[PDB]
Amino acid sequence: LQSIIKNIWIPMKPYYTKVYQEIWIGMGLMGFIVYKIRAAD
Amino acid sequence: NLFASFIAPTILGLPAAVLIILFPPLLIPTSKYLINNRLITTQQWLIKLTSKQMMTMHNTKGRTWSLMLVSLIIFIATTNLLGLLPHSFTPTTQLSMNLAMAIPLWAGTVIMGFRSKIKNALAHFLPQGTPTPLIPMLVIIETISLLIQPMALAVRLTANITAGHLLMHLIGSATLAMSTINLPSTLIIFTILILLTILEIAVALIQAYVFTLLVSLYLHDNT
Amino acid sequence: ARAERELKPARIYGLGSLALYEKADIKGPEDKKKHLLIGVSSDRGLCGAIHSSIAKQMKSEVATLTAAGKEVMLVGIGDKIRGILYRTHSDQFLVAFKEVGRKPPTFGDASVIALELLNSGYEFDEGSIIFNKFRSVISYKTEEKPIFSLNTVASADSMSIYDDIDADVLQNYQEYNLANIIYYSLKESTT
Amino acid sequence: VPPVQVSPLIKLGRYSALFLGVAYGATRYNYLKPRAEEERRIAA
Amino acid sequence: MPQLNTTVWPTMITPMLLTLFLITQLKMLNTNYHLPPS
Amino acid sequence: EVKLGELPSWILMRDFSPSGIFGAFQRGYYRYYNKYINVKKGSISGITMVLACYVLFSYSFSYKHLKHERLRKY
Amino acid sequence: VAYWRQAGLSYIRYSQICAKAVRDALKTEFKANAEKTSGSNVKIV
Amino acid sequence: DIDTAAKFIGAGAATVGVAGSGAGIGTVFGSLIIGYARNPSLKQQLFSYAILGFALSEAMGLFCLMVAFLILFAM
Amino acid sequence: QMSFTFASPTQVFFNGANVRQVDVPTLTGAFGILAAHVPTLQVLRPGLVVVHAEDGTTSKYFVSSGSIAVNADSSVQLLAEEAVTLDMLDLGAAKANLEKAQAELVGTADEATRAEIQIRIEANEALVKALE
């Protein structure tokens, strides 16, 4: 709750919210690919 | 028997791959001081030099990714270097981790080029001064080229580390097998092994820098 | 008058020719022995202390070089300098030139002097040209410009930054700079 | 390097256990070796 | 090839996603190069 | 601390909570860091010792495979 | 090493010949003052 | 049986394709030697391009080895 | 960044002026010089020099024989014994000189003199091809 939002999320906010957006879209695509790969096996 | 070094490790039944993968950052201590020990001095100099190398060629929109790219290279380099110690499991030899490092970043940069920049993004699928009877065909080429960009990335690491490690191990076998036959032959094979280990150090650092550089080039072409 | 009109473009020219030896910092050969000493004067006297200054510097310098062990061969552009320095330094003399001074010196003159400086068969290790640098309508100063050989410009380490150079292209370049520096100096002396 | 010689208690326990340890290593060999070699024959 | 055993993939993806996107980045964010004094 | 106690009660007096074990590990890292790394004129030993422990841990999980390559039989 | 160097010609001779060829191909309107501004007069001795 | 046999033959054939990356890396670093001996002030940038070229060439090489194992163990 | 000093023994066309690119016909081939060009020093052969100005406009000269020097400091010195504009030359005289030079070539028999005739030939040929 505390010191997790303090030392982990305040510094990473400018990146997780604005810079890494398409990175998150890509992680969605990657997760879908990995799900389909592990499924066809 | 031979690929045993690339099987997911377990200790007492637990997945030690977690510890192995999370350990590298423990080797980059940080401090608020102005004048600190030799370790942090050298590491900050290295990160300064790496950021100067990787990020200078970008405009500001790309330079926003400086944290991500320098962290990428610092993670991969220490992972590969820690893979060289004896009896160690190198998580970069796994296709899983490398695909998960490649597909996110590359997809993110291609989408970033596709959200803004959209005209130039669809235009770069065609080289500029291409003559007319090749404008359609070439597009397919570029298209499939793009579609192969991420997988290539992943493989270019997963193979190059994996192969590398196998090689050393094999020569290891060789020298052991010749330890009971010809002692000078054992020594010469051990010399081959030493040269190969030096090559492996260099190729670990180079593969880290290459993964980073190619993600950087995709970023630059899509910002 | 016309002389100082032609001297400005010729000064730009002849100083651009030397920009290489300045940006490359050719240090000159400190080991080589043979030297070629050119002196620029005219054929007409009664013009002041021009020829006297040229001859005094040339004979002083050749004396110092032959005292240091280096053999010097003297070339005199102009009848005046040849006359005034022949008496004491005739043994050390390579070739002389006349009919300079009546007409304004041109580039053909420099080409001819350079030809007879190369076809003379005297492979000089280093050289110097002594002329009267025009400073103003009142003042002139005796200057000594250097002339490098092929082996010294080739052996110079900064010339390793210059690409596509071998013995042939440096040979052509050194010959043409010899001609250029002679033209520039001639134009500086007639003013 | 100046001598920092073992303390007398070291001499005591170290020496007694050294003697018993080497002797017991010999007897452990002579205990495990015969069964070892008969199983060497039993290799087939 | 053990790399092909697609049943052990998550345990390789998940910690990496941390190390590459949280812990190493948090360690760089604490690496600051102040400006030079006068 | 240990190296002084000779009673089992200490083992019951210490904490065994998640935050507790996290704190213990953190105190350990800082003790090692302050002793061998975080000094000027520090030595390489401060790192090679960590690397040696890493090799020991990596040999520990690699023993299950190595036991199939034993050279003798007893 | 071009042909004229193998014949023994210095670069000075090459420059003379090429410049004279360009000069002779000048239109007569400029040719006179051109070949005056570049003609030689030194004598060898 | 015939399938394991042909898998061996196919792996050998597939691994032949590393010759191209061998020669391509040779060419890259040879041209790096030349381009450096030509303008040794751009060394940094030169080396950058060197690595890049290497990265792509060996990339193709790894692809070959990839198919090799794809044939030897995957199927 | 390019300081170009195209100069004749009696005329100056540029002096430290900033142009974007120049093409020169060196004895070892033609090439284009731009900013930061690798440092070179070369001797020229009769032919066209095309100076591309920063305004995108090009000034075409014809040089007979000189020396180009590209320095570490982006300074380019182009010293040409005979630099002329293209309207300053005619085509008939050049053609006549070329053909009479070829005739004398098939006539002349001494080595150095033959080389001289061939140099005249190449100058006149580069000249005619530069004109039209």
Binding site: - | - | - | G13, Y15, L18, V22, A26, R28, K33 | - | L4, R72 | - | - | -
Partner: protein, 77 residues
């Protein structure tokens, strides 16, 4: 180099016959400590030290087994 035999000849030697009564003295001391229970009063510092000297002498036993089989890695049999 030669310091090796120096320290070994002063320290790594079997018990002299004058020390075997000393030896039984020490052994009776340890078993007396076990008899009373004073080992519980031993701080884990000296306890760990004794454990280490015990591990060292057990290693001496294993080295003796090594000298018994005239080979090192396992039984040549």
């Amino acid at each position: 180099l030669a310091t090796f035999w120096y320290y070994a000849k002063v320290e790594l030697v079997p018990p002299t016959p004058a020390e075997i009564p000393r030896a039984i003295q020490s052994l009776k001391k340890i078993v007396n400590s076990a008899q009373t229970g004073s080992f519980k009063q031993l701080t884990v510092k000296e306890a760990v030290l004794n454990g280490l000297v015990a591990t060292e002498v057990l290693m001496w036993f294993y080295v003796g087994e090594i000298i018994g089989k005239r080979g090192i890695i396992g039984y040549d049999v």
